[PDB]
Amino acid sequence: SLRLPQNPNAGLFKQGYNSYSNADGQIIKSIAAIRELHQMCLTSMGPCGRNKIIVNHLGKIIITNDAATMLRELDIVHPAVKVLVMATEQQKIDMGDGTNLVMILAGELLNVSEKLISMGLSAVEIIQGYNMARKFTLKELDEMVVGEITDKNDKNELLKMIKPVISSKKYGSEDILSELVSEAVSHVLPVAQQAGEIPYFNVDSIRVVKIMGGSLSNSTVIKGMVFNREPEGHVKSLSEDKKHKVAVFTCPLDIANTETKGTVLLHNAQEMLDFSKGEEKQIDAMMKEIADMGVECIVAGAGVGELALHYLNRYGILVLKVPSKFELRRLCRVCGATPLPRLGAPTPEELGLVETVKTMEIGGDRVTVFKQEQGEISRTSTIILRGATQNNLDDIERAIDDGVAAVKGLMKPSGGKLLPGAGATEIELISRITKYGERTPGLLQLAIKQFAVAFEVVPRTLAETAGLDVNEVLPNLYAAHNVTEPGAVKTDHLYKGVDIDGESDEGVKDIREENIYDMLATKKFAINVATEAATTVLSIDQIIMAKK
Amino acid sequence: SLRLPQNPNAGLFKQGYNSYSNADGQIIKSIAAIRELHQMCLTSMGPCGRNKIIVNHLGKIIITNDAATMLRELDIVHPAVKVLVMATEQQKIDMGDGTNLVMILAGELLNVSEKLISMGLSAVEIIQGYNMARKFTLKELDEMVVGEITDKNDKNELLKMIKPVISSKKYGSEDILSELVSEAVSHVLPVAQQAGEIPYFNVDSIRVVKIMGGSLSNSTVIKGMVFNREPEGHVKSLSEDKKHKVAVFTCPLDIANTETKGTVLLHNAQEMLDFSKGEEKQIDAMMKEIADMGVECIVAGAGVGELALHYLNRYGILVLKVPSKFELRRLCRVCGATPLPRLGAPTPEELGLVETVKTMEIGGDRVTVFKQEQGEISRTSTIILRGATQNNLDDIERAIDDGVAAVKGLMKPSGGKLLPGAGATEIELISRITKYGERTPGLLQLAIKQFAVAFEVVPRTLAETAGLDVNEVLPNLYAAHNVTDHLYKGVDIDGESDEGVKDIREENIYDMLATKKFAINVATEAATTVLSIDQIIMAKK
Amino acid sequence: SLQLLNPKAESLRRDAALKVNVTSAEGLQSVLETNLGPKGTLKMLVDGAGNIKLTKDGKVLLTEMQIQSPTAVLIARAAAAQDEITGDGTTTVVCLVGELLRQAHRFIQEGVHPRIITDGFEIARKESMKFLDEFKISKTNLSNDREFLLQVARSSLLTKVDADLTEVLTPIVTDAVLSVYDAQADNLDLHMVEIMQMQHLSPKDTTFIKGLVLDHGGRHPDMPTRVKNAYVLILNVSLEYEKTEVNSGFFYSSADQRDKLAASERKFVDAKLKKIIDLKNEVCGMDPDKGFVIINQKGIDPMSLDVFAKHNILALRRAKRRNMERLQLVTGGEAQNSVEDLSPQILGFSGLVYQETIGEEKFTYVTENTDPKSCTILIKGSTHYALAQTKDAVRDGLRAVANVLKDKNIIPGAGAFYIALSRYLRSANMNKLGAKGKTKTGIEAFAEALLVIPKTLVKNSGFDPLDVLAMVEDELDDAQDSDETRYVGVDLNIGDSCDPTIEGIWDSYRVLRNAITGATGIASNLLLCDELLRAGRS
Ligand SMILES: Nc1ncnc2c1ncn2[C@@H]1O[C@H](COP(=O)(O)OP(=O)(O)O)[C@@H](O)[C@H]1O
Ligand SMILES: Nc1ncnc2c1ncn2[C@@H]1O[C@H](COP(=O)(O)OP(=O)(O)O)[C@@H](O)[C@H]1O
Ligand SMILES: Nc1ncnc2c1ncn2[C@@H]1O[C@H](COP(=O)(O)OP(=O)(O)O)[C@@H](O)[C@H]1O
Ligand SMILES: [Mg+2]
Ligand SMILES: [Mg+2]
Ligand SMILES: [Mg+2]
């Protein structure tokens, strides 16, 4: 009576092991645990979304509104939350787009599931309700698609793709951020129209260089790569033009050393007198063949000895240090060169072409300019990013990567397949699934009708973060979808969407004029990952933890 | 596999409770635990027994060979020992003799049961084996008594009763200690031609007053009582007054006051002058009637005021405090008076007679001597012990208390008779129990044969404490009973014990019949309880 | 009496030890009670390091979570060894051992000795073996029925996952075991089928590949990614910096000798490269359309990668050791250690060779073989635990189907084997059995303990286990007098019985034979253990 039996036969497992089952409201506590981190990403959704500050154990601060980036530094405890954390990371890797949608959609499916479980629906019937409704959802997305990108590169068409993607990440000015990204994409495209070749694109081609100081309006696009380096012998503006011939050596420049027990052997004083002048003639003979080929610049991958740097300054040859690997690998893609390990005379067919190499002060340090020109086009262009704070420079770099990942979506599928933006995609699916829930007899219609209710979070979040009442604005939007379709074709009511601030009362007319659209390839995997993320949580009847 | 399940019953009851049950322990295990205290009593048995020093938490040291006294001052955590401890306490309270026999006999009955349980004999049939063997033992003790005596009066008749008891305790003194008890019993018994109807006798008739210093041979017997007090007011008159009337007053001597708290209320100064002489003449009126009756001694248990002591000093009347009430009734039995709580005046029928009173120092401290010669005393006496150490005289007082306890056990029933000692009776009981098992076939024969084996510890303890071999003298003792003269064979303690046979009638060493009957019944029941407890339940601390 | 032998020791015996084996096995079975069945619960394990293990397999629960009770350690080692050989039976043995102890514990309280109880277990188990010969149904492999392998594979798939992943993985496992069956009849499970974890798309997009896939790809850009006809050359020799033998080294007299001795490092590397070039001179016919690839077991010196780039030769380094043994089964060539002896016969053949670069890792795909002797299964998953959930689901389905092709017989599932033993052991005459008297009671405890598994299946469906088995016993009563032999199963969807042969529910032969034999020895040794103590020097 004084002390409990304290769960007899609990010694079967260690004291750190705990058992949590769907019974005793733990499945409700798991859903309630999602709402703790769900509201964190709700205020970050949309162009008006609010960025968040997360301080790790090392002191590094990353300010971003991206749900996939924020969940990386956070330490997660509840097991089912890690299902939602790792679900948003896959969306950022695969499509590089729609990361905040997976976080919000998978969290709302569990919120509407709390009412489904309370009514007595078993975990098996709830899973079957979302799987049957998702298959109908993916089929309706292909029916509601409007327009296409058609040609790969265009000045105007790239403003209907990258611009609406970067509008949510560091909104700021529209045309300023869109022109910087759209310029670097046109350089890495092989073009070659009418040739019938298979298009190709690399997401790691475009590199963002973070340089503090200045302003965003002072940023520009550089066709070549930009590094922070100090030339050893001399700096040269290379105003003599006629371009240049450049060679890249992944191996360092120095006398070849034996990998085992390199040692100087001198038997008599006769060999010692010629040992000092012998090493000078070796580098002279090797570097003379390079200078005879007209090579004004040499890219090195490791430390170069001083004896080798002497003869390079004699013929006026620049010296570049390219540490590690990936930094040197993208240099040859600019000039179209093939590295070779030997120090001998390079092949003229493997030599690159760079017209000018400049060194100027940007952020207070000397940077080398690899920028290319109109002719002899180059690939893997870099974008100089100027900013006052380094925290803004980090997320804009990820904001540009979101626009670069959107270019990848123009390659694998048949086209761009633009979808109505401003939340009009998830709203139209509500009326279609509602009709689909009635067409299915049985008890499975409860999970299907509530599956469309979870799509109401997109219009409510965009309206709440915009400073508008969700009770006045949201029902007024259904008035366009409540009139269904008339006796005549050509219905433009599908372009209605949610507006930020301004005059409210729905607004922005038809979004076709606003030019903001969504990607179909992004919405395909965004719904599949978010559904499986909530399905995994609902499919687990018992959760076991260790040590805590 | 690192941690045990802890059992489900761990949550039941509490962690402080400990359990010892069948197959869980005990079962000749706990019997091996009492062997440590059993060996303690084996070395203290007999006249050659060894005394044991015990220091209580208070610091008082009690040196004695009595098992009932030793086990009383020892704090023992083992519960089943208390069954044997409380068994020895009954022997001291009722009979007062045989405490060492109860602890030794009951301890061996559990030792001989070690072989019985090892053979698969259940404890249910073991209890029935000792019960039927105990009934046959008590029935055979009557035919072995050659010491039936109808006297219980003459002093020489007590040499076969009191003296054998004193032979065991403080064996260094025989005729000195026996004369002190035998003379004290002769004083407390009334002188008459024939005294029947079992005259009353109690252990309060003989007392022991221990005085430090002096040899034990210098001790004597005093018919009165010896208390340590300070006389006041005058020196005694010796025999000049011859027999003097002694008045014992329960209430103190002073002007009678109410139980409630009073105070003096004086309205005028006329009563103040008479207040000084008022209290003087008020108490003097009650003290004057006492001197007219010839009362030379007044005993008031409570404190006597100085106003009452003033008058009694000039008339030559003795005053003695006697603070303790228990010793107050003892002085009344010396003179034969009636304690009077009232003051009044002494009546002739209620006053006693004391021959003489003197104040002397036996050991250097002044004590008052109540010794009365030629006078009539009823159930009162004392024994003054003289010794160099206090601890040695402690067991001597217990030896005297055990000597007078035999008189109480002899006088109260029809009689205690006598039994042959020095291992004579214990060997005869072996042949009786052994032959009794063969008369009735059954499974109880195993418990009957082992019941007679436990009787071998008493006769060999006398040989073991004498520095003798139990594999020679003891086996040769059974051959001496082969066949009156075969019932008198016993154990010999001496350098002449090599023959192993000494006649008991020479030294006249006898034991009481009623003592052995009461000792076996308690020892058998004590060993029966240990075997009848299947499960033990302990507690925290 | 142990406290006298050791100053500090813990021991429990008789009724104290009898509650050890009964209660500890009851708590362990309760964890796997909700696991048994296709509708069973799904458990996730999260350790202190952050790893996540999500599976329905009872073996992962025992290995990841430590057990302090020594009684379950004997059961955990028995349930683990059951999945090792037979690939199935982990949760079955736990339910058998835990229940058989409780069914026999009621008579122990009645005063029946444990030995005569365990003696009846062997008498009742030997009858399950004699009945197993008439219970099993023979299947001839000469028919080559594909539908039979589909229904058997779905037995383990529907338990671990739902019907979504079952329909996808059903033809994959069947196509994997199809190449295992050969005229030699020998079935080798490890080399024929593998599990390769890669995160791509969704777990439901898992597809089957008819040729070996590797975790490595071409390091040099000019190496052709897609090669129409490639000749795979097996090389177990590594071209790279060697141990050099205590590093003796070079000593040069003049600076001209310093670079002259440095060229000796490439003398040994280029010596083995000339043999590959001479081997290419035989296959040079139709060089633009065809190709030549090299797969090495150990890392290759990047200094020599530029040699294979000029000749358009794909090089693969740091390959697994087991992958070297499968290159003869996939391509059809032979292995070559020393490059001195080279022949066109040892060269393999592939109809399609391509590489798919996803992220930083690059994977090489090989398919379209003339007569491929082995295949692969590419496991795709969304999350790290999703790769392990499919890994445990497919691997457990491998031993289930592989054991079918080993013997000629197959055991029907759906509790038809456990219900048949109940009517057999209870209605069998005891004079035929070697058990008599009190040993008759021990057989009844074994027959009643077998009816909990078909009842445990119903506990996960929500229906009353007592009412659903009332219709099963009533069907088997009239089936004997109607001259009709039909096996009655348990359908959890409608809460009624069914036929495992018509529904397609089948169980492996080696699983149930080793489970009952294994579960009997565990429970018998626990009932015969009357004392549990702990002693040792630490
Ligand atoms: N100015 C705007 N007006 C209306 N809707 C907008 C506007 N800018 C963005 N949106 C909508 O807000 C959504 C935000 O998408 P988001 O979840 O941020 O994508 P990601 O996580 O990949 O950055 C977009 O789908 C877009 O349709
Ligand atoms: N001088 C002696 N010679 C031989 N035996 C003696 C002598 N003195 C005592 N004994 C024996 O020693 C035994 C001591 O027994 P004891 O412990 O006094 O019995 P109880 O416990 O009844 O008092 C007596 O039975 C007596 O026969
Ligand atoms: N869909 C089903 N319907 C009826 N019974 C099934 C079904 N799936 C599995 N079972 C039964 O469950 C038992 C255990 O199957 P399984 O989980 O594969 O083995 P284990 O429990 O040893 O891991 C089998 O004997 C089988 O008869
Ligand atoms: Mg976006
Ligand atoms: Mg005595
Ligand atoms: Mg299985």
Tab-separated table of N, CA and C in Angstrom, chain A residues 9 11-14 17 79 82-83 86 90 94 124 131 134 251 255-261 263-266 271 275 278-279 282 286 339-341 525 532 536 539-547, chain C residues 23-24 27-28 31 34 39 41-48 50 52 54 64-69 72 164 201 204 241 244 247-253 255-256 258-259 262 265 303 306 382-385:
chain	number	residue	atom	x	y	z
A	9	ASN	N	8.374	-8.275	-13.214
A	9	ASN	CA	9.068	-8.857	-14.375
A	9	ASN	C	9.478	-7.795	-15.398
A	11	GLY	N	12.548	-6.622	-15.178
A	11	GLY	CA	13.962	-6.900	-15.327
A	11	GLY	C	14.335	-7.670	-16.572
A	12	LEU	N	13.359	-7.998	-17.423
A	12	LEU	CA	13.657	-8.687	-18.673
A	12	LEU	C	14.527	-7.834	-19.587
A	13	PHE	N	14.439	-6.513	-19.464
A	13	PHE	CA	15.224	-5.586	-20.262
A	13	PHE	C	15.937	-4.606	-19.340
A	14	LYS	N	16.908	-3.892	-19.907
A	14	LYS	CA	17.644	-2.892	-19.148
A	14	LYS	C	16.714	-1.773	-18.696
A	17	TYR	N	15.538	0.896	-21.205
A	17	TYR	CA	14.583	0.587	-22.259
A	17	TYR	C	13.174	0.967	-21.822
A	79	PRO	N	11.256	9.340	-31.724
A	79	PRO	CA	11.621	8.556	-32.919
A	79	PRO	C	10.802	8.894	-34.152
A	82	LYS	N	11.955	11.848	-36.275
A	82	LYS	CA	13.052	11.586	-37.201
A	82	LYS	C	12.546	11.040	-38.529
A	83	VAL	N	11.392	10.368	-38.521
A	83	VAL	CA	10.758	9.963	-39.771
A	83	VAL	C	10.387	11.191	-40.592
A	86	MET	N	13.982	13.035	-41.647
A	86	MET	CA	14.670	12.411	-42.772
A	86	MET	C	13.834	12.423	-44.045
A	90	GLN	N	15.353	14.057	-47.954
A	90	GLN	CA	15.342	13.366	-49.240
A	90	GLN	C	14.767	14.252	-50.337
A	94	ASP	N	16.879	14.901	-53.818
A	94	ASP	CA	16.327	14.434	-55.085
A	94	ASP	C	15.980	15.572	-56.040
A	124	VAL	N	-4.852	-0.028	-40.053
A	124	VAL	CA	-4.813	-0.633	-41.380
A	124	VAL	C	-5.743	0.108	-42.334
A	131	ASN	N	-3.441	5.663	-49.283
A	131	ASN	CA	-2.832	5.085	-50.477
A	131	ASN	C	-3.772	5.169	-51.673
A	134	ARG	N	-3.966	8.881	-52.677
A	134	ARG	CA	-2.754	9.426	-53.281
A	134	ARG	C	-2.636	9.016	-54.743
A	251	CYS	N	49.533	16.980	-60.604
A	251	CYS	CA	50.715	16.688	-59.812
A	251	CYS	C	51.508	17.963	-59.545
A	255	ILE	N	61.217	18.206	-58.745
A	255	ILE	CA	61.979	17.047	-59.194
A	255	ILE	C	61.308	15.779	-58.692
A	256	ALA	N	61.152	14.803	-59.586
A	256	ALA	CA	60.530	13.541	-59.211
A	256	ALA	C	61.345	12.852	-58.125
A	257	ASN	N	60.682	12.520	-57.023
A	257	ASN	CA	61.325	11.913	-55.868
A	257	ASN	C	60.941	10.444	-55.777
A	258	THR	N	61.912	9.608	-55.420
A	258	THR	CA	61.642	8.192	-55.222
A	258	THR	C	60.742	8.004	-54.007
A	259	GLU	N	59.699	7.188	-54.166
A	259	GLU	CA	58.740	6.972	-53.090
A	259	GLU	C	59.341	6.247	-51.893
A	260	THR	N	60.547	5.696	-52.022
A	260	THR	CA	61.186	4.946	-50.948
A	260	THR	C	62.610	5.450	-50.765
A	261	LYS	N	62.892	6.010	-49.587
A	261	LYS	CA	64.250	6.334	-49.149
A	261	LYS	C	64.970	7.225	-50.168
A	263	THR	N	67.398	9.798	-51.140
A	263	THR	CA	68.631	10.174	-50.465
A	263	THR	C	69.654	10.618	-51.500
A	264	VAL	N	70.451	11.621	-51.142
A	264	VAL	CA	71.521	12.115	-52.001
A	264	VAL	C	72.756	11.251	-51.777
A	265	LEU	N	73.258	10.645	-52.850
A	265	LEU	CA	74.451	9.806	-52.804
A	265	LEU	C	75.582	10.507	-53.541
A	266	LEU	N	76.652	10.828	-52.815
A	266	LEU	CA	77.843	11.440	-53.394
A	266	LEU	C	79.056	10.632	-52.951
A	271	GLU	N	81.332	14.467	-57.908
A	271	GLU	CA	79.880	14.425	-58.032
A	271	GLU	C	79.189	15.476	-57.175
A	275	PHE	N	76.369	18.549	-58.368
A	275	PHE	CA	75.051	18.255	-57.816
A	275	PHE	C	74.194	19.508	-57.682
A	278	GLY	N	73.210	20.462	-61.198
A	278	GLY	CA	72.468	19.418	-61.887
A	278	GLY	C	70.967	19.566	-61.736
A	279	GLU	N	70.506	19.889	-60.524
A	279	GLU	CA	69.074	20.055	-60.301
A	279	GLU	C	68.535	21.298	-60.997
A	282	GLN	N	67.636	20.355	-64.592
A	282	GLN	CA	66.497	19.457	-64.754
A	282	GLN	C	65.199	20.241	-64.905
A	286	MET	N	62.783	20.829	-68.295
A	286	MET	CA	61.372	20.460	-68.281
A	286	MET	C	60.472	21.665	-68.523
A	339	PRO	N	43.991	17.011	-67.827
A	339	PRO	CA	45.196	16.933	-66.996
A	339	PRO	C	46.032	15.708	-67.327
A	340	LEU	N	47.346	15.855	-67.159
A	340	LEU	CA	48.275	14.748	-67.296
A	340	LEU	C	49.308	14.835	-66.179
A	341	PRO	N	49.700	13.694	-65.604
A	341	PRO	CA	50.579	13.736	-64.424
A	341	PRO	C	51.997	14.193	-64.719
A	525	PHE	N	6.867	14.018	-56.201
A	525	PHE	CA	7.613	13.424	-55.100
A	525	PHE	C	7.333	14.101	-53.765
A	532	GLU	N	4.145	8.892	-47.298
A	532	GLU	CA	4.851	7.779	-46.674
A	532	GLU	C	5.434	8.167	-45.322
A	536	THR	N	4.223	5.961	-42.246
A	536	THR	CA	5.158	5.234	-41.395
A	536	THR	C	4.847	5.455	-39.919
A	539	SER	N	1.727	3.511	-39.101
A	539	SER	CA	1.906	2.072	-39.229
A	539	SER	C	2.667	1.462	-38.060
A	540	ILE	N	3.156	2.276	-37.130
A	540	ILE	CA	3.928	1.799	-35.991
A	540	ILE	C	3.003	1.781	-34.781
A	541	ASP	N	2.650	0.579	-34.324
A	541	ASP	CA	1.783	0.454	-33.159
A	541	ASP	C	2.547	0.614	-31.852
A	542	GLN	N	3.818	0.216	-31.816
A	542	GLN	CA	4.605	0.262	-30.592
A	542	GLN	C	5.984	0.837	-30.882
A	543	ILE	N	6.428	1.747	-30.017
A	543	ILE	CA	7.720	2.412	-30.144
A	543	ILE	C	8.559	2.064	-28.923
A	544	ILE	N	9.814	1.687	-29.154
A	544	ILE	CA	10.743	1.316	-28.093
A	544	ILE	C	11.973	2.206	-28.198
A	545	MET	N	12.400	2.759	-27.065
A	545	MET	CA	13.572	3.617	-26.996
A	545	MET	C	14.588	3.030	-26.023
A	546	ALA	N	15.835	3.478	-26.158
A	546	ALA	CA	16.938	2.979	-25.351
A	546	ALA	C	17.642	4.134	-24.656
A	547	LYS	N	18.079	3.885	-23.417
A	547	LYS	CA	18.900	4.802	-22.626
A	547	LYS	C	18.119	6.040	-22.188
C	23	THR	N	7.787	-16.898	-15.605
C	23	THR	CA	7.456	-15.480	-15.707
C	23	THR	C	8.327	-14.766	-16.734
C	24	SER	N	9.624	-15.086	-16.779
C	24	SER	CA	10.511	-14.429	-17.735
C	24	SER	C	10.133	-14.775	-19.170
C	27	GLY	N	6.930	-12.688	-20.166
C	27	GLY	CA	7.153	-11.317	-20.591
C	27	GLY	C	7.817	-11.217	-21.948
C	28	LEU	N	8.648	-12.201	-22.300
C	28	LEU	CA	9.290	-12.190	-23.609
C	28	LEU	C	8.302	-12.556	-24.709
C	31	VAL	N	5.985	-9.643	-25.713
C	31	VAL	CA	6.554	-8.666	-26.637
C	31	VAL	C	6.363	-9.125	-28.077
C	34	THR	N	2.133	-9.696	-30.025
C	34	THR	CA	1.562	-8.791	-31.011
C	34	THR	C	2.349	-8.763	-32.314
C	39	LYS	N	-1.062	-9.062	-39.669
C	39	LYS	CA	-1.661	-7.880	-39.066
C	39	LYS	C	-0.946	-7.451	-37.793
C	41	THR	N	1.797	-6.009	-34.953
C	41	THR	CA	2.274	-4.658	-34.708
C	41	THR	C	3.668	-4.452	-35.297
C	42	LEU	N	4.006	-3.186	-35.519
C	42	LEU	CA	5.298	-2.782	-36.055
C	42	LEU	C	6.067	-2.016	-34.987
C	43	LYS	N	7.285	-2.466	-34.697
C	43	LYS	CA	8.105	-1.899	-33.637
C	43	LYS	C	9.314	-1.183	-34.223
C	44	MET	N	9.688	-0.067	-33.603
C	44	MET	CA	10.873	0.693	-33.970
C	44	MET	C	11.839	0.733	-32.795
C	45	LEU	N	13.119	0.509	-33.081
C	45	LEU	CA	14.167	0.507	-32.072
C	45	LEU	C	15.091	1.695	-32.294
C	46	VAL	N	15.294	2.490	-31.245
C	46	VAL	CA	16.182	3.645	-31.284
C	46	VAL	C	17.161	3.523	-30.126
C	47	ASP	N	18.444	3.374	-30.446
C	47	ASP	CA	19.479	3.241	-29.436
C	47	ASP	C	19.979	4.619	-29.003
C	48	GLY	N	20.987	4.627	-28.128
C	48	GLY	CA	21.558	5.879	-27.665
C	48	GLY	C	22.446	6.565	-28.681
C	50	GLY	N	21.641	6.998	-31.866
C	50	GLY	CA	20.808	7.674	-32.839
C	50	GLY	C	20.316	6.797	-33.969
C	52	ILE	N	18.241	3.951	-36.056
C	52	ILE	CA	16.830	3.578	-36.065
C	52	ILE	C	16.696	2.239	-36.775
C	54	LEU	N	13.683	-0.279	-37.807
C	54	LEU	CA	12.243	-0.484	-37.931
C	54	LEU	C	12.009	-1.787	-38.684
C	64	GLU	N	19.296	-6.308	-30.677
C	64	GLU	CA	19.517	-4.897	-30.378
C	64	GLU	C	19.276	-4.586	-28.905
C	65	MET	N	18.238	-5.170	-28.313
C	65	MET	CA	17.909	-4.925	-26.915
C	65	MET	C	18.545	-5.992	-26.035
C	66	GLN	N	19.267	-5.552	-25.009
C	66	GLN	CA	19.889	-6.474	-24.071
C	66	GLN	C	18.843	-7.068	-23.135
C	67	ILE	N	19.133	-8.266	-22.635
C	67	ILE	CA	18.226	-8.997	-21.759
C	67	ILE	C	18.975	-9.349	-20.482
C	68	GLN	N	18.486	-8.846	-19.346
C	68	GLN	CA	19.104	-9.162	-18.064
C	68	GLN	C	18.701	-10.540	-17.557
C	69	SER	N	17.501	-10.996	-17.889
C	69	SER	CA	17.033	-12.287	-17.397
C	69	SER	C	17.771	-13.416	-18.108
C	72	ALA	N	15.528	-15.803	-20.689
C	72	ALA	CA	15.293	-15.379	-22.064
C	72	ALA	C	16.555	-15.432	-22.912
C	164	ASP	N	1.218	-3.456	-50.680
C	164	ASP	CA	1.856	-2.541	-51.621
C	164	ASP	C	3.264	-3.007	-51.971
C	201	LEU	N	14.607	7.437	-55.202
C	201	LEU	CA	13.158	7.533	-55.363
C	201	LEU	C	12.411	7.100	-54.109
C	204	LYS	N	8.911	1.712	-52.991
C	204	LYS	CA	8.022	0.951	-53.859
C	204	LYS	C	8.521	0.866	-55.296
C	241	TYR	N	51.019	1.462	-55.193
C	241	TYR	CA	52.168	1.438	-54.299
C	241	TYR	C	52.120	0.197	-53.415
C	244	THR	N	56.686	-2.500	-50.440
C	244	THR	CA	58.064	-2.155	-50.792
C	244	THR	C	59.106	-2.911	-49.977
C	247	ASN	N	61.244	-0.854	-47.207
C	247	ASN	CA	61.611	0.410	-47.847
C	247	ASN	C	63.133	0.586	-47.886
C	248	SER	N	63.751	-0.195	-48.774
C	248	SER	CA	65.190	-0.087	-48.980
C	248	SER	C	65.531	1.218	-49.690
C	249	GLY	N	65.078	1.372	-50.927
C	249	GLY	CA	65.102	2.656	-51.601
C	249	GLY	C	66.193	2.746	-52.655
C	250	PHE	N	66.289	3.943	-53.229
C	250	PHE	CA	67.219	4.252	-54.303
C	250	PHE	C	68.286	5.226	-53.819
C	251	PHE	N	69.464	5.139	-54.431
C	251	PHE	CA	70.554	6.076	-54.184
C	251	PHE	C	71.119	6.513	-55.528
C	252	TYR	N	71.012	7.804	-55.826
C	252	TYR	CA	71.446	8.355	-57.102
C	252	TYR	C	72.726	9.159	-56.919
C	253	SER	N	73.658	8.996	-57.860
C	253	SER	CA	74.931	9.703	-57.783
C	253	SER	C	74.808	11.147	-58.257
C	255	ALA	N	72.148	14.295	-60.341
C	255	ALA	CA	70.764	14.720	-60.525
C	255	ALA	C	70.132	14.072	-61.750
C	256	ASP	N	70.938	13.738	-62.762
C	256	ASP	CA	70.408	13.030	-63.922
C	256	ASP	C	69.953	11.625	-63.556
C	258	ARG	N	68.733	10.872	-60.555
C	258	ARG	CA	67.575	10.996	-59.674
C	258	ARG	C	66.276	10.808	-60.449
C	259	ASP	N	66.139	11.497	-61.583
C	259	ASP	CA	64.989	11.289	-62.453
C	259	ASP	C	65.093	9.999	-63.254
C	262	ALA	N	63.676	7.437	-60.964
C	262	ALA	CA	62.257	7.647	-60.698
C	262	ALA	C	61.381	6.964	-61.740
C	265	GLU	N	59.734	3.213	-61.154
C	265	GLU	CA	58.462	2.930	-60.499
C	265	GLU	C	57.385	2.577	-61.517
C	303	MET	N	47.774	6.915	-61.110
C	303	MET	CA	48.760	7.192	-62.151
C	303	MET	C	48.487	6.382	-63.412
C	306	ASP	N	45.008	7.043	-66.435
C	306	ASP	CA	45.068	7.757	-67.704
C	306	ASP	C	45.425	6.840	-68.867
C	382	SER	N	13.643	4.888	-48.931
C	382	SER	CA	13.582	6.320	-48.661
C	382	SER	C	14.511	6.720	-47.520
C	383	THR	N	14.614	5.885	-46.490
C	383	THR	CA	15.359	6.206	-45.281
C	383	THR	C	16.287	5.052	-44.926
C	384	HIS	N	17.185	5.316	-43.973
C	384	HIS	CA	18.145	4.301	-43.549
C	384	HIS	C	17.444	3.076	-42.974
C	385	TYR	N	16.415	3.285	-42.150
C	385	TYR	CA	15.684	2.148	-41.599
C	385	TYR	C	14.821	1.472	-42.657
